[model samples]
Target: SVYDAAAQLTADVKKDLRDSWKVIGSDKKGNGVALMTTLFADNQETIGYFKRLGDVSQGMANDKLRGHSITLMYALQNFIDQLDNPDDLVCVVEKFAVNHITRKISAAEFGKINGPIKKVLASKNFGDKYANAWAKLVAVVQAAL
Candidate 1:
């Protein structure tokens, strides 16, 4: 079952995520900006969603984008914090999925973030365990979607 995927985030995996988050979450603004910037760069079509931001051609320096990045990072923080409680995590993920679904964002499009996220984690030397843990989390989210 798709729900079983959440179980993959075992004690060791949660520890890896919690440990690495100390660094990544340290600068939520900067890291979030980097992650979204990379995602937009790789998938230009994604920029269509932020038409309200106006002129994102340069980078993620726009105020709205910065604010959203922080929001995204905080959401991730909550996800990590709730790893021990799969029920809560899945509920949150489902709600998040519904929000995106209303905006016509397909699950396949959501999956695109996995690459950008892994790239950021690798750059921070948190690739091995941290990356795996994130992959599991993503799988759970994708399943929910």
Candidate 2:
């Protein structure tokens, strides 16, 4: 019963986040700009976050483990966007994190809110990667408050 209540509470919070994030435009540059203002980072870091143009950029994902994980997270987050309830939601996140994400997302992108992560959020919600990332994003609201 407590788990059910917790699930329901998480669901309600998720509904609010889904409602808010759904308003975002598909143009990730636009989305990142809207989001990074919520961060303490510089404007340049905000805009350049998406491009894998440099060694630092490319190398960031080049680590044997992390690059592989991100490629997985990139795909899995698409899945997470589909489920509704937090029970269904956390199930997917647990699957992705255990199967894919925790190892894949790099030390760089780990908590550094950036464009790819936003893209991961905005365009698709196929399963657990979406759930894992959404859970993190949803949790960020308390700080914004």
Candidate 3:
């Protein structure tokens, strides 16, 4: 069923995302931080795993956070851009998963992000159709992570 939803991700969805993703921020890094900050705020316990987050206030403002966030957003955008290419998506997800697993990032942490991501997307007028597709995308990435 999740795959079914993922399969529904149309070219229109990708176009809309690419066209208005700027709404998230001036750059991917800012948007990434915004998303990550929301995740940390919504799930404080999740931050315990990352040492950088120990000092929540300072950590939120740190360059490392911005760098990491930027990477995540761009990686995600790349995956979204190749939405019709499962092989490419899988390759990208696997690479991210290996990195996270090596860093001891737990599946639970990956799972926790879905809520905030979906909420943010919905708030940005992603709507039910795209939300379902995005959920599937997250689910796929979560599984790999």
Candidate 4:
């Protein structure tokens, strides 16, 4: 019930984000940077997890950050775009889960990223109305992980 409400509320914004991030355009890079920043700001421990990138500033310049962030954007859009396909969605989530497990990432840590992401999206004028939608997706993805 709650999830359906969140889904209905976020449906449009989800589609919009997917459409906007599908390309390797300026928005994609900018938003990817924002998301990566949010991820660490929300959980500084993540910096330790992604040690190869050094720190947040280094993460910005490092290919791992640039590549993973954009790649994450692409994967996120696909999850939203192919919502009807459970198999495809899990495939994407599995890739994410496998990649992070080596870093000792847990489902709870995965969910925490939603708050900063919402803040970032709101700063970009994504509006507050879609908060439920974002939360719902984060919860789903975390559980999948």
Instruction: Specify the highest-lDDT model's number.
Output: 1
How big is the positional error of residue 141 in model 2, measured in Å on the Cα after superposition?
A: 15
Residue pairs clashing, model 3: none
RMSD of each: 1.6, 9.9, 3.4, 4.0
Candidate 2 clash figure, as a count:
13
Lowest-scoring 10 consecutive residues by lDDT in candidate 2? 136-145
Alpha carbon lDDT at 61, candidate 2: 47
Model 4 / residue 121 / CA error / Å:
0.6
- Please report, as a residue range, the 10-residue window in candidate 4 with the lowest summed lDDT: 1-10
Residues 5-94 of candidate 1: C-alpha lDDT, one tens digit per residue: 788888888888789889999999889999989998898989898787676665565888888888999889988877888889888888
Q: For each candidate, what is the lDDT?
A: 0.83, 0.42, 0.69, 0.65
- TM-score against truth, every candidate: 0.90, 0.35, 0.74, 0.74
Candidate 4: tens digits of C-alpha lDDT, residues 1-145: 3233234424575665454334423466678888788778777766777767555676568777788778777766666665666566566766766777766778888777777877876776665555555676666556645
Model 4 misplaced stretches (Cα beyond 4 Å):
1-26
On TM-score, the leading prediction is 1
lDDT of candidate model 3 versus the reference: 0.69
Error of 1 at 24 (Å): 0.1
TM-score of 3: 0.74
